[PDB]
Amino acid sequence: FTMKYVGSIDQGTTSTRFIIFDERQRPVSVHQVPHTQHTPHPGWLEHDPMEIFRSACKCMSVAIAKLRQKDASFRKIEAIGITNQRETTVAWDRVTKEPLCYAPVWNDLRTYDITKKVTAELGGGDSMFASKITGLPVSTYFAAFKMRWMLENVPAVADACRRGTLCFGTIDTWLMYKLSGGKAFVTDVTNASRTFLMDLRTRKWSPELCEKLKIPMETLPEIRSNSELFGYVETDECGVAAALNERTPIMGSIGDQQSALFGNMCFEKGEAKNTYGTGCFLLMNVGEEARFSKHGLLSTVGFQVGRDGPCYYALEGAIACAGATVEWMRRNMNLFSHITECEKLARSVPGTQGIVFVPAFSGLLAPYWDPSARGTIVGMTLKTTRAHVIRAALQAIALQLNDVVGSMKRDAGLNLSSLRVDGGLSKNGLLMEIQASLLGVDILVPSMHETTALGAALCAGLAAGVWTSLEEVKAVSRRENSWKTVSPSGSAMEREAMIAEWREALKRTKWAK
C-alpha cells in the first residue's frame, strides 16, 4: 500500500520553498524561488506580495511534478502546512483581492517615528507597557506599527479603510487567503503573537489595543491554532490545483521560528532551539504556563495543536550578526575565501589570547539592548592574526547565546536541558563545541536539516492523521532521522575567565551618536 505525503510552504525572508514530506518525515521533493528585496531608502525593506504568492505556487507545482516522476503512484498530498517570516505585513482589498502596496518586512525601519509617537502617547512612555498583554516591547519589528504606517502613509490603504474593504495579514494569512481564493481569512496563534494586537494568555485579539492603536478590528483575521483545517487549495496560479489532483486541505500554519521549535521536537518545557541563520533566534519551550521577562526578551506562543488542545508558550531572544559576521569576515575583510577556512583557522590557535571581538555591527540586542554599540575588537598585539579574530568572532556568538540563555533561565524559572541547533552555522563544529561548553548542555544537530519546514508539515499531518500523536512523531523522528550530539567539555575556570573578558569588552562597544 502507498506512502502518504504532507506539503510545506516555507515562506522565508529572501525566498520561498515547497517541501513534500513523506510519513517517515523525509523531505522527498523540494523547489525554491527567490523574491526581490526592495530597499527604497536606507533602513527600509519591502516585498511584493504577489511575487511571494506566485513563488509559493511555482514551488508547489514544480515540486509536485518531480515527486510524480520518482513515485508515479503518488495520487495526492494529505495536507499542506504554512510557515513564514513573522510580522511582515500585507494590506489587501477584499473584492480586488490584491495588494494595496508592497509589504514592509520584520527588520524594516520606516515605522521608527511611529514607534516613538506610540510609546509616549499610549503607554505613558513605558516600553514593556503592553508586555503583560502582548509579550512584546514597542519596537519597529511588529505588525501593528507597519499596519499603522500603512494607514497613515498609503493613499490606496487609507481609502480602502473607509470603503470598508481593507484586510490586514501577516504572511501566513496572505498565503492562506489566496490559496483558498478569497475563501479564508485566518491567522494562527504564533503569528498573531507578533502583531502587537494579541492578548498573550487568552490568545484572542485585544479590543483595547486595536482601539488604542487605531486599527479597525474588522480588518483583522480570525485567530486559530497551528494544527486544524484552515481552508482548501482552490486556485490554478501555476498549475497548482491541477498538480494537486484533489482539493488538498491547508491544515498547518505557524511562525517560522516556532516552526523550528516544533520541528526540532522541543515539546516539553526547558527544551530550546537556536537557529543560526544570518542572525540568531533562540526559543525555549517554557510550557503551558506563559512567562514574562526583566531582561527585555520576548514572551511568545510556542505552539498549540488543535482548538482548545494545550497551548505551550516560550521566551525568545536574538542576535543580529551571526552568519552575517562570518560572511563579513570573508567578503568585507578578506580574512579567508572558501567557507570551510573559517573553522580551520579558528581551530589552528590555542585561543583568542586576550583579544575580544564583539561583532555588534548593528548594536547589541538581547539582554543588553544597546542601539549605540558597534563592531569592536580589543586587546590586539603584533602577535594577533586573522585566526584569533575568526576564533573571537565565534566565541562572541556563543557568549551572546550564553548571556541570552542565562537571562531566559532566570525569568523562565527553568534550566535549559538540551539545545537543538539549525541553520548553516550549526555545521561548524568548533562553535557548537564552545556553545555546549559555555551553556553546559548537550547540543543536538539534526542531519535532516530542514526543521522549519517540518514544523509546518507536522501540524498539517497531525490534523489529518498521518501521525496520531506527538509521541508517534517523536518516535518516528528517532526511528528515521539522525541526531548528532555535541557534549560539554569545559574547564569551569575557563568559562569564568572567558565571560570576564566578555563582560569587560562590552563596555567599550558604545559608539554611535
Binding mask 319-348 for a copy of itself (x = CB under 8 A): --x--x---x---xxxxx------------
CB atoms within 10 A of CB 303: 28
Spatial distance between the Cα atoms of 79 and 302, rounded to a whole number of angstroms: 22
Select 65 or 512, whichever has its Cβ closest to a copy of itself. Answer: 512
| Pair 316, 139: CB distance under 8 Å | no
Q: Considering only 77-85, 214-222, 297-305, 504-512, which stretch makes contact with a copy of itself by CB under 8 A? A: 504-512
Spatial distance between the Cα atoms of 331 and 337, rounded to a whole number of angstroms: 8
Select 450 or 501, whichever has its Cβ closest to a copy of itself. Answer: 501
By three-state DSSP, how is residue 438 classified?
Answer: helix
Rounded to the nearest whole angstrom, what is the least distance from the CB of residue 399 to a copy of itself in the complex? 17
Select 201 or 386, whichever has its Cβ closest to a copy of itself. Answer: 386
DSSP notation for 271-334: EEEEEESSSEEEEEEEESS----TTSPEEEEEEE-SSSSPEEEEEEEEES-SHHHHHIIIIIT-
Looking at 120, 229, 242, 512, which residue binds a copy of itself (CB under 8 A)? Answer: 512
User: By CB under 8 A, what part of segment 264-323 binds a copy of itself?
Assistant: 321
H/E stretch holding 254: strand 249-255
By three-state DSSP, how is residue 431 classified?
Answer: helix
Rounded to the nearest whole angstrom, what is the least distance from the CB of residue 141 to a copy of itself in the complex? 18
Spatial distance between the Cα atoms of 501 and 354, rounded to a whole number of angstroms: 8
Select 7 or 359, whichever has its Cβ closest to a copy of itself. Answer: 359
CB atoms within 10 A of CB 227: 27
Which positions make up the binding site? 13-15, 22, 24, 26, 86-87, 256-257, 278, 424, 479-480
* Residue 16: strand pairing partners: 11, 33
Which positions make up the binding site for sn-glycerol 3-phosphate? 13, 86-87, 256-257, 278
Spatial distance between the Cα atoms of 29 and 70, rounded to a whole number of angstroms: 9
Decide if residue 2 touches a copy of itself (CB under 8 A): no
Select 380 or 470, whichever has its Cβ closest to a copy of itself. Answer: 380
Rounded to the nearest whole angstrom, what is the least distance from the CB of residue 57 to a copy of itself in the complex? 34
Closest CA to 225 of 301, 287, 167, 315: 301
Contacts of residue 402, defined as CB under 8 A and 6 or more positions apart, other chains included, come to 435, 438, 439, 499
CB atoms within 10 A of CB 250: 26
Closest CA to 500 of 415, 399, 376: 399
Question: How many residues touch a copy of itself (CB under 8 A)?
Answer: 30
Rounded to the nearest whole angstrom, what is the least distance from the CB of residue 375 to a copy of itself in the complex? 3
Looking at 44, 129, 292, 361, which residue binds a copy of itself (CB under 8 A)? Answer: 361
Rounded to the nearest whole angstrom, what is the least distance from the CB of residue 335 to a copy of itself in the complex? 6
Select 335 or 431, whichever has its Cβ closest to a copy of itself. Answer: 335
Spatial distance between the Cα atoms of 434 and 54, rounded to a whole number of angstroms: 42
Select 324 or 430, whichever has its Cβ closest to a copy of itself. Answer: 324
Spatial distance between the Cα atoms of 205 and 222, rounded to a whole number of angstroms: 9
Decide if residue 508 touches a copy of itself (CB under 8 A): yes
Binding mask 367-396 for a copy of itself (x = CB under 8 A): -------xxxxxxxxx-xxx--x-------
Which positions make up the binding site for ADP? 13-15, 22, 24, 26, 257, 278, 424, 479-480
Decide if residue 123 touches a copy of itself (CB under 8 A): no
Rounded to the nearest whole angstrom, what is the least distance from the CB of residue 354 to a copy of itself in the complex? 8
Return residues touching a copy of itself (CB under 8 A).
321, 324, 328, 332-336, 354-355, 359, 361-362, 374-382, 384-386, 389, 508-509, 511-512
